């Protein structure tokens, strides 16, 4: 039983796709697949798994199935009555955002406006999550996906494993994306995702760098709790960096909600001095 948006659902509400209709085409590093012919991504549950994994896999399907928003990956259905169990998801040809940013770093293509559109897309999905009282807890470039690599790309939130687990360790907590009250006190609110979004904004405008580059998790923990924050990414416009620093306010109630983040991102897309800024090679 999973609840969201004022309703409660169960494994039954999911759309079971008969296994015979599903064909795997590739590994994606998850598989590309066909459903008879719709092209999909296939998330597989290892047959070698515990019964916690089973519950976890099922809950992720229910979670994703109850979102209806263009910046959140669609769930096409499931194939749970055959082994290995499948979740069928929208196919995102552009791949994960972190890799796209690294592979697409300008070299001897990408402009500031393109980064702002990615930021806006994800902020729009986060707003929808906040409006529906869903806390993602793991907003980060590695969990975002792009429809296509070329122009006209749309970014969407593509993984919900963290929200499903707390619905798995200290050395596995995404400490570099978390605000103080989250890694000190275990408190998670919509303002937790606001902080993380600021880190994601830094990943975007650094073009896929690891946050707090030369620091370890514990060092970041002590840095952040002492009031330290990352410097601007190379060539980052001040209006964009100002969004990051607002997201990283020490007190959650001093951080903006996603309606205001979106507002400020759109104001950035309007500033020639911002969108005419050159990205570093």
Ligand X SMILES: Cc1cc(-c2cccnc2)[nH]n1
Query: Can you say which residues are annotated as belonging to the binding site for ATP?
Result: 43, 90-92, 159
Query: Which part of the chain contacts ligand X (CB under 6 A), choosing from 85-93, 183-191, 192-200, 212-220?
Result: 85-93
Which whole-number Å values give the CA distances from 1 to 42, 58, 74, 166, 167, in the listed order? 23, 10, 20, 15, 11
Query: Which part of the chain contacts ligand X (CB under 6 A), choosing from 15-23, 51-59, 91-99, 201-209?
Result: 91-99
The torsion angles phi and psi of 72, rounded to 5 degrees, stand at -130, 125
Kindly write out the interface string for residues 21-50 of this chain, putting x where it contacts ligand X by CB under 6 A and - elsewhere.
Answer: -------x-x----------x---------
Window 240 to 269, contacts with ligand X (CB under 6 A)? none
| Best CA proximity match to 75, nearest among 158, 8, 166, 3 | 158
Window 115 to 154, contacts with ligand X (CB under 6 A)? 145
What is the total count of residues that contact ligand X (CB under 6 A)? Answer: 12
Q: Shortest Cβ distance from residue 96 to ligand X (Å)? A: 6
Question: Given the DSSP bridges, would you call strands 144-146 and 86-90 parallel, antiparallel or unpaired?
Answer: unpaired
| Best CA proximity match to 206, nearest among 229, 179, 231, 228 | 231
Note whether 91 binds ligand X by CB under 6 A. yes
Note whether 208 binds ligand X by CB under 6 A. no
Query: Which part of the chain contacts ligand X (CB under 6 A), choosing from 89-97, 172-180, 228-236, 261-269?
Result: 89-97
DSSP code at position 42? E
Q: Annotated binding site, which residues?
A: 43, 90-92, 159
Query: One of 96, 121, 138, 193 is an active-site residue; which one?
Result: 138
In whole angstroms, give the CA distance from residue 97 to residue 157: 10
Note whether 75 binds ligand X by CB under 6 A. no
| Best CA proximity match to 129, nearest among 200, 57, 60, 67 | 67
Q: Which is nearer to ligand X, 149 or 280 (CB)?
A: 149
Crossing angle of helices 112-131 and 258-269, rounded to 10° = 160
Note whether 200 binds ligand X by CB under 6 A. no
Structure tokens at 265: 């991102």
One of 95, 161, 232, 252 touching ligand X (CB under 6 A):
95
Structure tokens at 269: 């897309």
In whole angstroms, give the CA distance from residue 229 to residue 204: 16
Q: Shortest Cβ distance from residue 261 to ligand X (Å)? A: 25
In whole angstroms, give the CA distance from residue 160 to residue 164: 6
Q: Shortest Cβ distance from residue 259 to ligand X (Å)? A: 27
CB distance 11 to 58 below 8 Å: yes
| Best CA proximity match to 277, nearest among 233, 239, 237 | 237
The torsion angles phi and psi of 277, rounded to 5 degrees, stand at -75, 135
Q: Which is nearer to ligand X, 73 or 244 (CB)?
A: 73
DSSP code at position 21? G
Note whether 158 binds ligand X by CB under 6 A. yes
Q: Shortest Cβ distance from residue 53 to ligand X (Å)? A: 18
Q: Shortest Cβ distance from residue 1 to ligand X (Å)? A: 24
Residue 138 annotated in active site:
yes
Note whether 96 binds ligand X by CB under 6 A. yes
Q: Looking at the annotation, which residues are catalytic?
A: 138
Interacting residue ranges for ligand X, rule: CB under 6 A: 28, 30, 41, 73, 89-92, 95-96, 145, 158
């Amino acid at each position: 039983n999973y609840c969201f948006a004022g309703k409660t659902s169960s494994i039954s509400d999911l759309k079971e796709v008969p296994r015979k209709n599903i064909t795997l085409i590739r590994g994606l590093g998850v598989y590309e697949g066909q459903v008879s012919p719709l092209q999909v991504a296939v998330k597989t549950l290892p047959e070698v798994c515990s019964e916690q994994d089973e519950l976890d896999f099922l809950m992720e399907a229910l979670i994703i199935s109850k979102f209806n928003h263009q910046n959140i990956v669609r769930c096409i259905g499931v194939s749970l009555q055959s082994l290995p169990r499948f979740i069928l998801l929208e196919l995102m040809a552009g791949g994960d955002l972190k890799s796209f940013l690294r592979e697409t770093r300008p070299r001897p293509s990408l402009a500031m406006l393109d980064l702002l559109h990615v930021a806006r897309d994800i902020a729009c999905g986060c707003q929808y999550l906040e409006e529906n009282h869903f806390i993602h807890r793991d907003i980060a470039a590695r969990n975002c996906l792009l429809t296509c690599p070329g122009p006209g790309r749309v970014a969407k939130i593509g993984d919900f494993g963290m929200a499903r687990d707390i619905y798995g360790g200290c050395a596995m907590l995404p400490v570099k994306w978390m605000p103080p009250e989250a890694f000190m006190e275990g408190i998670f609110t919509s303002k937790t995702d606001t902080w993380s979004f600021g880190v994601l904004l830094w990943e975007i405008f650094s073009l896929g760098y690891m946050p707090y580059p030369s620091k370890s998790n514990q060092e970041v923990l002590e840095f952040v709790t002492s009031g330290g924050r990352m410097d601007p990414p190379k060539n980052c416009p001040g209006p964009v960096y100002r969004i990051m620093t607002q997201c990283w306010q020490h007190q959650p109630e001093d951080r903006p909600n996603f309606a205001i983040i979106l507002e400020r991102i759109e104001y950035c897309t309007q500033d020639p001095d911002v969108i005419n800024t050159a990205l570093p090679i």
